[PDB]
């Protein structure tokens, strides 16, 4: 009764998966992660809910994670570029110990904080002065003569002492013509089909937190703990456990550490640790025992379903360099490395935690060490020297999740062993961006009609 004609519709609601460049959106502290170059966010970032649609998400193949990884590295670097390189400090250090014997149990130092003297060229090139500084054991190596760790083979750059590293939430925004889809399903688990899909121009803000073993200040699970993995059976993959409740962790570096300024060139000032006023103590972190016990009881129930009948064993890290085999976080520029042996202390039957005897202990303590020479991403980017920050440093954070790996999974005794392992920092960011996918919009479409043009 009619012929069909080709008509063009513009504003057609279709899309295809695509990877593009995202931009960021968000006091004179020069925050490195959230610079003044960020655009402001939309006060009313209205979310659009899709109808009966399905989409396939895969957090393990998500290019947003990879793009973030590169952005964090580029922001770390660059920010540290216009600063003192400390090459002149790579000289023989003549070191000795300090007297820590000034009842501070769980807080005592034992043979660390070495007193080193050195010969450094002053701001005037033909004049050499003897200078003194205290170093953390983990920052020096013996040749007693010492050298700064990692001087050979790398350049350690001092952060400019005005710049903050505090994480500030960063929102990722698609360019116009693109959109970010998110999976809101309670059943999503980081992979496969999702039926509750909505879209935004920008993601929620993500704090660019860097840590090892424990994920800090990320999002909590909406209701129940979710265990995510690319593969449960493959022991080589990281298992990300997202908590539905936070666990408080409180860390203290209880020393009156007063810094010293040393001129090692023409406007190049090195900030030394100076000395300690009062009784020197090691750093430590506390968590609530009751919270840890509840958290682990719920985690074992969940791991037990994945690995039924078998004994759940938690263990400490496998051993190695205390840069990557310990817990790590940053509070105000002080880099903490902490012993988590007490957190992954034991094993148990059923889903009943055990071997944490009832007693007056309320606070589980983790002994910590401080390093000034650090290597984020190991071989990627440059070594950095953290200035001391004047003493009495306290901070606290929200444990939002754990990174676990399986210890081979070759135990023939009906057990499974989990350790606070993990890989590259990509794992941390993957755990937060897991719900997002980037697509491109193709608004021009074609359909048959019954109209005809004059």
């Amino acid at each position: 009764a009619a012929k069909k004609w080709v008509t063009v519709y513009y504003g057609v609601p279709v899309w295809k998966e695509a990877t593009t460049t995202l931009f960021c959106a968000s006091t004179e502290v020069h925050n490195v992660w959230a610079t003044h170059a960020c655009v402001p966010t939309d006060p009313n970032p209205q979310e659009i809910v899709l109808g009966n649609v399905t989409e396939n998400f895969n957090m393990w193949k998500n290019n947003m994670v990879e793009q973030m990884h590169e952005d964090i590295i580029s922001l770390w670097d660059q920010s540290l570029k216009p600063c003192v390189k400390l090459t002149p400090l790579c000289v023989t250090l003549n070191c000795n110990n300090v007297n820590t014997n000034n009842s501070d149990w769980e807080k005592m130092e034992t043979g660390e904080m070495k007193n080193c003297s050195f010969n450094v060229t002053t701001s005037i090139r033909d004049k050499i002065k003897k200078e003194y500084a205290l170093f953390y054991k983990l920052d020096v190596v013996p040749l007693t003569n010492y050298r700064l760790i990692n001087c050979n083979t790398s350049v350690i750059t001092q952060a400019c002492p005005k710049v903050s590293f505090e994480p500030i939430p960063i929102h990722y925004c698609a360019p116009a013509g693109f959109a970010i889809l998110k999976c809101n399903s309670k059943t999503f688990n980081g992979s496969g089909p999702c039926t509750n899909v909505s879209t935004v121009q920008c993601t929620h803000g993500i704090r660019p937190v860097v840590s090892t073993q424990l994920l800090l200040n990320g999002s909590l699970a909406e209701e129940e703990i979710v265990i995510r993995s690319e593969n449960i059976t493959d022991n080589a993959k990281t298992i990300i456990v997202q908590l539905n409740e936070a666990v408080e962790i409180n860390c203290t570096r209880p020393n009156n550490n007063t810094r010293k300024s040393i001129h090692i060139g023409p406007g190049r000032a090195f900030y030394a640790t100076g000395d300690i006023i009062g009784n020197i103590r090691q750093a430590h972190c506390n968590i609530s025992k009751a919270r840890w016990n509840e958290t682990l009881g719920q985690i074992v129930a969940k791991l037990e379903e994945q690995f039924p009948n078998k004994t759940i064993i938690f263990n400490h890290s496998s051993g190695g360099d205390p840069e990557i085999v310990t817990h790590s976080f940053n509070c105000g520029g002080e880099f903490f490395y902490c012993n988590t042996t007490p957190l992954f202390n034991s094993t148990w039957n059923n889903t009943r935690t055990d071997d944490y005897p009832t007693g007056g202990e309320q606070n589980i303590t983790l002994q910590c060490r401080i390093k000034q020479i650090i290597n984020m991403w190991q071989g990627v980017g440059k070594a950095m020297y953290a200035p001391p920050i004047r003493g009495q440093i306290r901070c606290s954070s929200n444990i939002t999740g754990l990174l676990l790996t399986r210890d081979g999974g070759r135990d023939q005794n009906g057990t499974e062993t989990f350790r606070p392992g993990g890989g590259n920092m990509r794992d941390n960011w993957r755990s937060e961006l897991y719900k997002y996918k980037v697509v491109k919009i193709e608004p021009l479409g074609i359909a048959p009609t019954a109209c005809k043009r004059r």
Partner: antibody
Amino acid sequence: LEESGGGLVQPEGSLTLTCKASGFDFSDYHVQWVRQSPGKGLEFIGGIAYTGNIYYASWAKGRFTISKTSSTTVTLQMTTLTAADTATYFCARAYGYASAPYAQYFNLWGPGTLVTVS
Amino acid sequence: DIVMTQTPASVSEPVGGTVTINCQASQSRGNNYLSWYQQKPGQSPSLLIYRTSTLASGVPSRFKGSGSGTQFTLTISDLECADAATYYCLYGYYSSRNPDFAFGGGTEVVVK
């Protein structure tokens, strides 16, 4: 959600009841069946996981079959019925989660269907 | 299985007073596996509480839930006659091996 298929059945007869997802697709939801005989509280019959796993109550003891027959359609088969099985039968929804244990609290309760034996 | 017990039954209090319901259940697997329902005569039950301490949206500031392993209480802070109903306490644990679903017998609360 709405149930369907009630009515009177003879002794040792059978019924199939159907719960329809009237705009509530059972894609991420668990569908569960419960029973409430006159003057009583609620008995649990069983249900279907969003994953397809089907589980049953010790109350059914094999007399009931629970099955997802199509997207949006869940049925309850009941057999060898007696006077004691007269009750209002209901379907209800519970959220599925990407996990191992689930709280399974109920929501989206349907109006219920009467099954009577005589 | 799990056996849920509720008490007191046949509760009757004056309008404007308060009510508590005491629920018992062995082998609790946590307080996140228990919920409460409000059923008025002639209708389907409605979700009131979905976690021991968390109420469902639309529920007024009454029916506060509380508890510890095996020990659960619901408190009605305001006995408006609108809330005369039979209240049910539900326990369940979806599991691939042990669903553990049970309801108590319900507690009738009359507001005069």
